[PDB]
Amino acid sequence: MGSGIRVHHIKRRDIVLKWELGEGAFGKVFLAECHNLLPEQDKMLVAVKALKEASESARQDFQREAELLTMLQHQHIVRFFGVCTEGRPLLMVFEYMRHRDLNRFLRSHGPDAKLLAGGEDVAPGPLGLGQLLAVASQVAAGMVYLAGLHFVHRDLATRNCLVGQGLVVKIGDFGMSRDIYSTDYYRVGGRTMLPIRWMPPESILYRKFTTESDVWSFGVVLWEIFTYGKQPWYQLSNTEAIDCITQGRELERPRACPPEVYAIMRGCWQREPQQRHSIKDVHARLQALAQAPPVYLDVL
């Protein structure tokens, strides 16, 4: 009908790179200042993705990615600001989230954490049950919005969530999870990588991905939250993990996980996509649990 969503472009001169945050096979992510981006601040901190190569296949994909990212606006979806196509490399620019991806954040507040969390924003050490439920509730909120628009994520996981000032949790990533978290994907034939531990049996068996596959994945994200970012089926090989999912074996309740939260996970892990709890109902149950956190029983 008509061209479509228009990507805000950014002057290269209004972007000062500071240092890389991350690096991958086909990408680089930088912390940067962005001059005259928003009215209120002359400069402010941003996360800038730099595409490594500028081939016509990357240029097409990039514009499609940017159009898509520009379209999504929500309180629990990472803020996208625009691109810069004026000379190489191609750049995408997002809000900076100081606590990084939710997986890195959870591991830094685990019982097994190597150092203590810097901790001007949040208490170091394990998080409060009420905090865990606040994390889980905000991801569910971002999902409710994605499902609303018939958008299917296909790689939902704490690696692909970001944490900001005040423990704001949003859904987003810079496209580099297949590099930085390569053990989370199964190399299936050639240059297809699947996050099989977060996938339901209909996705593994029938190659089907729906809003209901996202719900299954979210169940595993809940398990990730209540284990402080542990890998699902961490003992198991990729092949072993596929056997479990396909044979109906379920992840065990985490020590930190109240049974009402475990019940939400099990609503997410129904074998039958149509028998799974809606993402709205899952969000509402978690909001309610977050407002009035259960006394998590005994560890005994």
Residue with tokens 């969503």: 5
Q: Which of 101, 155, 173, 214 is catalytic?
A: 155
Annotated binding residue 23: yes
Annotated binding residue 25: yes
Token digits of residue 144: 């409710």
CA 221 to chain centre: 9
Backbone angles phi, psi at 168, to 5 degrees: -70, 130
**Residue 179 annotated as catalytic:** no
Annotated binding residue 219: no
Annotated binding residue 21: yes
Q: Are 74 and 145 in contact (CB under 8 A)?
A: yes
How many angstroms separate the CA atoms of 283 and 93, rounded?
29
Backbone angles phi, psi at 45, to 5 degrees: -80, 140
Annotated binding residue 148: no
Token digits of residue 265: 């996970």
Helix axis angle, 259-268 to 211-225, nearest 10°: 150
Q: Are 161 and 170 in contact (CB under 8 A)?
A: yes
Annotated binding residue 27: yes
Annotated binding residue 22: yes
Binding site as annotated, residues: 21-29, 49
Annotated binding site for ATP: 21-29, 49
**Active-site residues: which are they?**
155
